[PDB]
Write a protein that binds this ligand. Structure first.
Ligand SMILES: CCC[C@H]1c2ccccc2C=NN1C(=O)/C=C/c1cc(Cc2cnc(N)nc2N)cc(OC)c1OC
Ligand SMILES: [Ca+2]
Length: 166
């Protein structure tokens, strides 16, 4: 299965403030919806609670250590192992964040969908550093900037650099 990171972050890798997005870009979220259609969304509990509702049309899988945690319309996993078990047959899954959730799936990640917002916000949580020399850009696109989407931002997609033998 393809393990994909789905992330939107600013110039300093901010991905959150107080728990919410420091920015409001409806068009970005529509890109998320289009891209993840028919694939599982994997997210930490805090991240899911910040969004408020199950995102329709996808397996919403919430990752928490809490064995008692349950929520309507969502599945719950308590470890990476359980997530991979649950997505046994999936073609591609999207790690939807929680800085800590990205860290858990780092050893397995195959594809990066990264929205880079060209602005510096106030934030308290960050997309962990990554050595991008292992990664190759396969797609880029300038996001729609307008009245409802004030900032400038870009969709980037990365796959693994293949490496030429000695
Ligand atoms: C309204 C239409 C889209 C709707 C939706 C409906 C169905 C299926 C998927 C989605 C996508 N999200 N949708 C939302 O309202 C909320 C998205 C959201 C997300 C993220 C994470 C995220 C944000 N962005 C990126 N690129 N990576 C990401 N990992 C964080 C949020 O608050 C912290 C969110 O809520 C503001
Ligand atoms: Ca892998």
């Amino acid at each position: 299965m393809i393990v994909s990171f789905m992330v939107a972050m600013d110039e300093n890798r901010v991905i959150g403030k107080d728990n919410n997005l420091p920015w409001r870009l409806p068009s970005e979220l529509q890109y998320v919806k289009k891209t993840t259609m028919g694939h599982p969304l994997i997210m930490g509990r805090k991240n899911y609670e910040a969004i408020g509702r199950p995102l329709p049309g996808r397996r919403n899988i919430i990752v928490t250590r809490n064995e008692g945690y349950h929520v309507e319309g969502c599945e719950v996993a308590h470890s990476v192992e359980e997530v991979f078990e649950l997505c046994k047959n999936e073609e591609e899954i999207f790690i939807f964040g929680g800085a800590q959730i990205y860290d858990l799936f780092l050893p397995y990640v195959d594809k990066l969908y990264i929205t880079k917002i060209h602005h510096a916000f106030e934030g308290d949580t960050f997309f962990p550093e990554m050595d991008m020399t292992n990664w190759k850009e396969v797609f880029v696109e300038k996001g729609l900037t307008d009245e409802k989407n004030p900032y400038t931002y870009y969709y980037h997609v990365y796959e693994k650099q293949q490496l030429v033998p000695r």
